[PDB]
Structures are given as C-alpha cells and as structure tokens.
Subunit: 36 residues, 6 copies
C-alpha cells in the first residue's frame, strides 16, 4: 500500500498505548486506595 | 483489505484506551477527594 | 462500508478519551492546589 | 455515513485531548515541584 | 480535500499530545524519584 | 501525497506517545510501590 504502511504503524503504536494506559489505571487505583 | 484491517485494529485499541482512561479519571478523582 | 464503520468507532472512542482526559486534568489541578 | 464526517470528529476530539494533556502536564509539574 | 484537511489537523494535534505526554513522563519520574 | 504525509506524521507522533506513556506507567508503578508504607 505505502499509505497502508503508516496506518499499520499507527495500529501498532495505539496497541502499545492501550497496554501502557491499562498499567497506569492499575497503578493509579493502588495509589488512590493507599491515600485512604 | 489491508487499510481496513489496520483501521479496525486502531478502533479496537482506541476503545481499550477509552476504558482505561475512564478508570484513571475515577482513581484521580478519588485521590483529589482524599487530599481534602 | 468497513473503513467507514471502523472510522466511526475511532471517532466515538476518541470523544470518550477527550471527556475522560478533561476530568483527569481537573482532578490533577485540584491535587496540585491541595499540595500548596 | 461519511469517512470525512468521522475524520473531522476525530480531529476535534484529538484537539480537546491536546488541550487537556497540556493542563495535566502543568499540574503534574506543580505537584512534582511541591514533593521536593 | 476534506479528509486531507481533517487528517492534517489530527497530525498537528497528535504532535502537541506527544510533547505534553513527554512532559508528564518527566514530571512523574521526578515525583517517583522524590518518593524514594 | 498530502494524506500520505499527514498519516506518516500521525504515525510518528503516536510512536512518541507510546514511548512516553510507557514511562508514565513505569513511574506510576514506582509511586504505587512507595505508597506501600
């Protein structure tokens, strides 16, 4: 595609953002629970 | 075929980011409420 | 079509991310104000 | 129905995310500076 | 014409999000380092 | 030409967001582990 290449890269990067954002959610919930 | 597949994957990943970001918002609001 | 469907889903998810991110900003500002 | 319509909506939502993310950066810097 | 315009706007907004997200990462690392 | 250019720029920016978000996750996990006082 060539156009296709860029879109595939966005797809991959967005998956990595999803995974990292889930870890932030987990860690922020732990912080909230400790802060009482 | 290829652009369609990658776009579907972006859609799925962005939905997962939305869900995780909502949990971060909830947890950060709890932290804010505890700090006062 | 398929690209149309996926693009609509990205649009919806990105709107939800916008809303959640604005709440994170509000809550983080309140945390900053409490920390003096 | 349109790809154009959905893409415009993504554009608008991403601008709102940009604005909110800049506020998170400001507020997180203030928190960091207070934590010494 | 319309898809092109919206895509350019997404590109610009995503660059601004990148810059802000890098600052959040820097500030959060400083918080982590202070918390020992 | 123009759609291609803008899409490449989105790709690059999203990669930078991915890298920064991973660092936020790491740092937030360290904060969580410290708050385990």
């Amino acid at each position: 595609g060539e156009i296709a290449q860029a879109t595939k890269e966005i797809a991959q990067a967005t998956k990595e953002i999803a995974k990292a954002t889930k870890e932030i959610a987990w860690a922020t919930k732990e912080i909230a629970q400790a802060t009482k």
